[PDB]
Amino acid sequence: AALDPSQPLSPAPPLSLFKAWAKPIKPFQITEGVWYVGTKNLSSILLTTPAGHILIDAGLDESAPQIKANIEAAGFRLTDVRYLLNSHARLDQAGGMARLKAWSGAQLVASQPNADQMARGGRQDFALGDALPFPPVTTDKIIHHQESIILGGITVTALFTPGHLPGSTSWRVTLRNGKTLIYADSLATPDYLLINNKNYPDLVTDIQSSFKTLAAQHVDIFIANKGDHFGLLEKRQQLRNGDTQAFFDSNGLQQYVERSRQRFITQLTA
Numbered sequence: 001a002a003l004d005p006s007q008p009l010s011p012a013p014p015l016s017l018f019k020a021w022a023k024p025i026k027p028f029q030i031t032e033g034v035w036y037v038g039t040k041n042l043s044s045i046l047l048t049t050p051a052g053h054i055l056i057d058a059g060l061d062e063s064a065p066q067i068k069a070n071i072e073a074a075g076f077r078l079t080d081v082r083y084l085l086n087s088h089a090r091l092d093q094a095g096g097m098a099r100l101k102a103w104s105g106a107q108l109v110a111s112q113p114n115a116d117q118m119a120r121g122g123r124q125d126f127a128l129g130d131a132l133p134f135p136p137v138t139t140d141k142i143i144h145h146q147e148s149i150i151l152g153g154i155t156v157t158a159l160f161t162p163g164h165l166p167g168s169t170s171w172r173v174t175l176r177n178g179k180t181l182i183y184a185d186s187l188a189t190p191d192y193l194l195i196n197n198k199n200y201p202d203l204v205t206d207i208q209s210s211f212k213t214l215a216a217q218h219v220d221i222f223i224a225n226k227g228d229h230f231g232l233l234e235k236r237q238q239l240r241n242g243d244t245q246a247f248f249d250s251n252g253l254q255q256y257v258e259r260s261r262q263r264f265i266t267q268l269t270a
Contacts, residue, residue: 012131049152064096098135113167163207187260222252
């Protein structure tokens, strides 16, 4: 849908909140070939392979130097990244894409709606309008539902999980060590403006199909685009105390789907 200015918009969060989420933390290894290079609550995942790397999400544009330094702190190099992957096209996941793509030469990969919104620098957001813009960037590869990318012995598969944004994309990864990982995009929806949203008329049915899509994915490792959706910090402390299995969580995704469904229901009731 084209943005209809007669459709009410949601209030944008203050920039101070995104900055609090953008607080840095030292990178760490989740499992072989999987490095956390994001911030306290904004996820970014580096998938390393002998043919180059895939980076999922980029954080704020203000954070782009920090994520590069995080990749380098872990021993890897941004110039080895072959693909940048986007979950959804807002500033706290895609703000740094323009510069990361410039610094790496990688191909940016995204769904068509995320590509459109990233090409607008975040403008015309169905819920936020132009409130939270970021550096515009061109997508090189449009990804489709259940389409796979292969690189260096891993497989990454797009799962369209719309609802948070029309183009919201989750990613299923099969690693060289045989383990499977999901990077779940947000399943959160806006208060009040859910129903009959002229800017996004399929929101309510989209998010319900996304619950089903993700609930059907049985994986070994649950990651999400925001740290408090998958227990990042408490898992990182279990890890850094000797539990190398900290992030192995075969039921975590299903629980996140259920928590998200319950929240969505209380929102529709209100």
